Ligand binder design. Sequence first.
Ligand SMILES: NC(=O)C1=CN([C@@H]2O[C@H](COP(=O)(O)OP(=O)(O)OC[C@H]3O[C@@H](n4cnc5c(N)ncnc54)[C@H](O)[C@@H]3O)[C@@H](O)[C@H]2O)C=CC1
Ligand SMILES: NC(=O)C1=CN([C@@H]2O[C@H](COP(=O)(O)OP(=O)(O)OC[C@H]3O[C@@H](n4cnc5c(N)ncnc54)[C@H](O)[C@@H]3O)[C@@H](O)[C@H]2O)C=CC1
Ligand SMILES: NC(=O)C1=CN([C@@H]2O[C@H](COP(=O)(O)OP(=O)(O)OC[C@H]3O[C@@H](n4cnc5c(N)ncnc54)[C@H](O)[C@@H]3O)[C@@H](O)[C@H]2O)C=CC1
Ligand SMILES: NC(=O)C1=CN([C@@H]2O[C@H](COP(=O)(O)OP(=O)(O)OC[C@H]3O[C@@H](n4cnc5c(N)ncnc54)[C@H](O)[C@@H]3O)[C@@H](O)[C@H]2O)C=CC1
Ligand SMILES: O=C(O)C1(C(=O)O)CC1
Ligand SMILES: O=C(O)C1(C(=O)O)CC1
Ligand SMILES: [Mg+2]
Ligand SMILES: [Mg+2]
Ligand SMILES: [Mg+2]
Ligand SMILES: [Mg+2]
Ligand SMILES: [Mg+2]
Ligand SMILES: [Mg+2]
Lengths: 328, 328, 328, 328
Amino acid sequence: DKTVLDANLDPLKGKTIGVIGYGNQGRVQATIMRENGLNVIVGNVKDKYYELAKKEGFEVYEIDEAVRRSDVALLLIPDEVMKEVYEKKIAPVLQGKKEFVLDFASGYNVAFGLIRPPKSVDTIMVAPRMVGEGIMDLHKQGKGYPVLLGVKQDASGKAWDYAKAIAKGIGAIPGGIAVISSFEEEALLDLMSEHTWVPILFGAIKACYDIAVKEYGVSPEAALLEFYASGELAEIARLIAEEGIFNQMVHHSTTSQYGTLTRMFKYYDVVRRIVENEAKYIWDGSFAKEWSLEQQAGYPVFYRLWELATQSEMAKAEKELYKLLGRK
Amino acid sequence: DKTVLDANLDPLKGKTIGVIGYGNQGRVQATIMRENGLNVIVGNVKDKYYELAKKEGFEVYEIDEAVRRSDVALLLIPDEVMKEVYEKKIAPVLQGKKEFVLDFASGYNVAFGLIRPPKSVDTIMVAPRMVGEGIMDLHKQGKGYPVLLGVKQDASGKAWDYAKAIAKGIGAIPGGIAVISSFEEEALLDLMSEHTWVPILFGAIKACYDIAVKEYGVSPEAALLEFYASGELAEIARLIAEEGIFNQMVHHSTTSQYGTLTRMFKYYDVVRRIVENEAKYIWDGSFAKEWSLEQQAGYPVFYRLWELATQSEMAKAEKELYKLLGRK
Amino acid sequence: DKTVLDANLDPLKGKTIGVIGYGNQGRVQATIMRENGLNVIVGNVKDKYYELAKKEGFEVYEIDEAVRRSDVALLLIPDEVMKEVYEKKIAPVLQGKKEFVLDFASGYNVAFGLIRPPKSVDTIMVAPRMVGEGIMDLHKQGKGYPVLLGVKQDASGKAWDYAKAIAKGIGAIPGGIAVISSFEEEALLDLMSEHTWVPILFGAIKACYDIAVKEYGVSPEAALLEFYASGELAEIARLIAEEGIFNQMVHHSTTSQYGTLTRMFKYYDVVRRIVENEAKYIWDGSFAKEWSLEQQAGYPVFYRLWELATQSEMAKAEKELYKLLGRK
Amino acid sequence: DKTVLDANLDPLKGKTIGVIGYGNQGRVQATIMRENGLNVIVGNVKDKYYELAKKEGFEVYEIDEAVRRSDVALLLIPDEVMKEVYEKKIAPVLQGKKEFVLDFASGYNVAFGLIRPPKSVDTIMVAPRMVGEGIMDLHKQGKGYPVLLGVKQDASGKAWDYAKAIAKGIGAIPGGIAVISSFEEEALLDLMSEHTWVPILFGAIKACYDIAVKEYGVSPEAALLEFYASGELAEIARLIAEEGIFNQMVHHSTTSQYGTLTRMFKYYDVVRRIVENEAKYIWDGSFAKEWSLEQQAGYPVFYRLWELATQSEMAKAEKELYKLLGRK
Ligand SMILES: NC(=O)C1=CN([C@@H]2O[C@H](COP(=O)(O)OP(=O)(O)OC[C@H]3O[C@@H](n4cnc5c(N)ncnc54)[C@H](O)[C@@H]3O)[C@@H](O)[C@H]2O)C=CC1
Ligand SMILES: NC(=O)C1=CN([C@@H]2O[C@H](COP(=O)(O)OP(=O)(O)OC[C@H]3O[C@@H](n4cnc5c(N)ncnc54)[C@H](O)[C@@H]3O)[C@@H](O)[C@H]2O)C=CC1
Ligand SMILES: NC(=O)C1=CN([C@@H]2O[C@H](COP(=O)(O)OP(=O)(O)OC[C@H]3O[C@@H](n4cnc5c(N)ncnc54)[C@H](O)[C@@H]3O)[C@@H](O)[C@H]2O)C=CC1
Ligand SMILES: NC(=O)C1=CN([C@@H]2O[C@H](COP(=O)(O)OP(=O)(O)OC[C@H]3O[C@@H](n4cnc5c(N)ncnc54)[C@H](O)[C@@H]3O)[C@@H](O)[C@H]2O)C=CC1
Ligand SMILES: O=C(O)C1(C(=O)O)CC1
Ligand SMILES: O=C(O)C1(C(=O)O)CC1
Ligand SMILES: [Mg+2]
Ligand SMILES: [Mg+2]
Ligand SMILES: [Mg+2]
Ligand SMILES: [Mg+2]
Ligand SMILES: [Mg+2]
Ligand SMILES: [Mg+2]
């Protein structure tokens, strides 16, 4: 099957590696790779992270200098400034090359064409699905974790080899797995998760609260406690990850099972339509356009929405309560 | 405010208490209350739980005998057999009384009239919001936890006093809180949670999977990994419970925040309508009717739905994967 | 292909067989199997059928006794009392077993979970498609007939072997065929036939009558004669079974062919939608629920519908006519 | 009530004030405040207004210099360049401060987040509802006029005090009133007025003209004369402002009253829906986004719409007529 469990690590030996950023990922991955027996450097703007990285023993230069030295580069920075940073401080130094390699952790800027490097370079992607802290929390046990792999440009016939090489160079495998796919699939998924069921969940909760209060004379404290001020949700998530989404429900009551299943099979079509709409809107690029334009405008909608959300009755009540329970 | 933080414990001293069941709750609460300095007994059918309860030092009699001895009773058994058990082995012994008290952990059977005790008895409810294990996991730290309180019948003018007495007798407060409300609100909430956002979430995930596969040529492994085979969901739940639902999102990226907020404010009305429909359907009693009838029929729909859910592509793929990762 | 034409008969030799019921099927199949060289018994309630079965030379005991003696059982009784009969007089005797086998002629009670035998037993199904009299009417020619096969539980790795063994033990093959499938498919089909085209046909006829009378001044006698008081329909059915559904039409006139084909391809979508709805309603279990509940209620709708049907103008006219033609 | 009629003027004495712009407002307010006994300066780009302000005796420096000198600032410039002007020539000088105050006449740029000053500064708003000339036309009578007040940031507990201080420092009160509100309400109102009834009025007039001509053979001159080429509208506005919107109608005829009231109560719902839509579209920020983007694009729609409006039949006819009547 497409899956991969282990591979070689030779293509990276003898070369120097360049790491852009020392935040969550950059820090973790550079730590691991150094612990794996490789010569690696760090490129970053002069700030707290720079101080931290030079504390932990990673020789540092300026960004463009790290690329001038490196034969491989890992661009571990946000997806909102990578564009300008590339355009200014990378593309030139890169034009001055023959055989180079560039890796990302996300496919947003590439799949949509905001970054079109030369055909003189092999472009790839290695994408984990952990916030970053759990990765160390696993490495100290000597485990592995799963990731996605992708390739965009091949000028060496060695692209996948370098991909698996990196995958092993960050302790993902052996111990976990590695999938192969494109940048497009990665971006599509990372965006569907954010556009489809998360906001739906939140809106459902908000509506349940509003209703239970304003049409059945219920108290905010009780509403919050039942809905989310408890850890029921977290325990459910854990049991899912461990046993399985459906098998999990066995630990509940028959009444819960019955209602859940009925209503789920009953409300499948609506959500299906919603998901179709959003997935299409993404596959085209409309969302990238929208987001870039809002950046250029000044995040007005962002501002107003944050405001409306925090000025809501549910939020105020949650504040009073979380205060009452000593929580921060 | 309606909230309560601590109260007296005198009305329970000098009396004997009766506990029906030694499962999750019964076990925990009886343990605590014994550790609080009260004379308590146990009533249960002769089985593994009976053996366990007599192991832990709780003198036991038959159910009706425990009531004959007790002046208070806690009916900690499922909401699907309580009816018959009451009708047969409790109502008589209870008719033979003057001043008694009966407490539940759920309002399903009462709010809907499936149980109508005499007016010779004060009826109450004390409902926690923890599965039961977390409660001990907190008690050994010396903390408290939150609960709901309710009263249905008063023949003593002491109902709320007994309520708070119990609340303190199970280590809820001081250390947490106690809310006051009816049986109706409790049932309504416990059912809305199960009918509105849980099944919606599950259906959304299922649809995202189906789509991403059958219309964009994506691999099941990647789909599952992104959606739920990871712990992203559990970490989100924890951060919610700790910091706050919205504040949580700060630890994410701006892109995620933007998409989430937009789509949430965009899809609020639909879910609102759904929630209205279900809440009404409950407030009337149609659901209780439906569930009781399906019990009398033989759980055919239950059976078929379990089958359809487990025979699904997502389930089979999850099986293969969870196996691949050593998970049970 | 999945089809089967003949197989072995050894696994049944040396064992005793139990047959529940001596009505249409039970009678025929027991007769055949005895004529095939097997030791078989009969279990039945004391009535006319009991007298008949002991007339024809089948030693009989009470039901539970027949199971105590038997190592295999064929439950040839209606699908409306099998539940209680099992629950009371079979499940105990069965709990007292190690290696047993149970066979049905219908999957209604099992596919929907109304009967959940232990995992100590191999459960199967052998379903013919003849009312029962035609089967003997064929056996005396030395032919075979077609059936369906299914398995639900396997604790021997011999389930299919026993299945084909029975199939041969009732003279189905060699001489006909045997298909393999589940209980679910069998039930689904047997119910679609009854829910989709039979009632549609009847309603179409009824409406044609009503219209031809009340809007074109036609006489009931003529209407009935054309529509169904003749044998046109039976001859068409026979020619279908013999030659083929479409080839049949060759023996009609060109005008008939033209109108039929046009209107058929013209009215396909409506019936398709209807069939989808009903098939879904079944696949879930709603129909089983409905039917069980009507049983528990007292067949009021059944009663009223029988009444309305018989008190109809078409029925009264058919009565007068069938009387006029000497028919009973 | 929230209203205010007079207050103190001490907090401004001993300080220096800075005024950005010498157009309509800036000119008037600076004139008044100087006439009120305060030390005030002027910051403006070198142009005709600079010459005018140094004519009238207001010592001037460059903008940033005026802020370096001032402890308070009034940003009386358009809402389309304030952004860049701030970003470049104000924010630095402001970072170099401890205790400062900044006031606006409009909340557009702030309510939507286009300007986010530091938390080292108290931000306020003082918004009149006169074009600017009427304000002097009233001051020479020794009257006052009404305004709105708002606060965004408080680092002194003196924000409202400074607000009322300014309010008195510009001759608004005593003699008129001062309301308190946010920036959001101000912006919302100033935009609803422009989006809801003004354009509706204009379109209604245009449509009445077009119809009366092209479907009833009426002459343009007569149409214009009746609709707006007369002063009926201005007299109505004046009588409204003086007596009251409804009481005004008393000076009309009964026929007019009847038709007006009927049709008004008849067409309320449509306009209500329109207003809801627009108010929402604003509350979110979509309009700010739209306008900023059109600026960045080059005002193409602006251009084309101006063209279409002026190339209209009504416009050409109005031109011929206004010429015929000697009007410019
Ligand atoms: N933490 C996460 O959520 C995961 C990371 N990724 C992706 O990896 C990439 C890195 O993400 P994170 O390291 O977690 O974010 P982060 O907050 O940890 O970023 C830290 C780095 O940002 C750099 N930086 C910030 N602003 C800069 C600017 N204007 N100019 C130049 N450098 C700047 C700094 O040098 C710093 O080293 C992103 O594309 C992310 O989507 C993929 C899987 C999940
Ligand atoms: N565990 C939970 O989810 C929470 C408990 N509750 C409610 O408290 C009550 C008890 O729930 P749990 O103890 O957690 O369930 P459980 O699974 O722990 O039930 C254990 C008890 O069930 C008794 N029992 C089982 N079948 C019986 C039967 N046919 N006849 C007589 N007794 C029988 C047994 O004596 C045993 O002691 C329920 O109403 C529950 O909804 C309220 C908050 C959450
Ligand atoms: N005979 C037919 O038309 C076909 C029969 N089948 C299936 O074979 C099985 C038997 O069907 P048939 O014999 O044809 O119907 P039937 O009405 O002729 O059944 C006769 C048998 O039912 C027994 N019985 C009736 N009421 C009973 C009760 N209260 N308690 C205990 N036993 C009772 C009688 O002892 C008798 O032996 C069913 O599962 C049916 O679905 C399958 C295809 C059609
Ligand atoms: N006149 C009005 O309609 C009322 C004024 N306001 C608001 O007060 C503020 C000022 O409005 P007005 O003075 O009436 O407009 P205005 O046309 O009178 O503005 C003249 C000033 O604009 C300055 N200026 C123009 N272009 C500039 C540029 N590129 N860079 C730097 N400075 C530039 C000039 O220095 C000049 O002093 C606005 O926000 C307005 O909406 C509030 C109530 C009504
Ligand atoms: O990179 C992303 O966009 C995140 C996701 O996995 O959804 C971390 C927030
Ligand atoms: O008692 C209930 O119905 C549960 C809930 O809180 O939803 C535990 C499952
Ligand atoms: Mg993301
Ligand atoms: Mg994700
Ligand atoms: Mg709950
Ligand atoms: Mg049938
Ligand atoms: Mg059939
Ligand atoms: Mg205005």
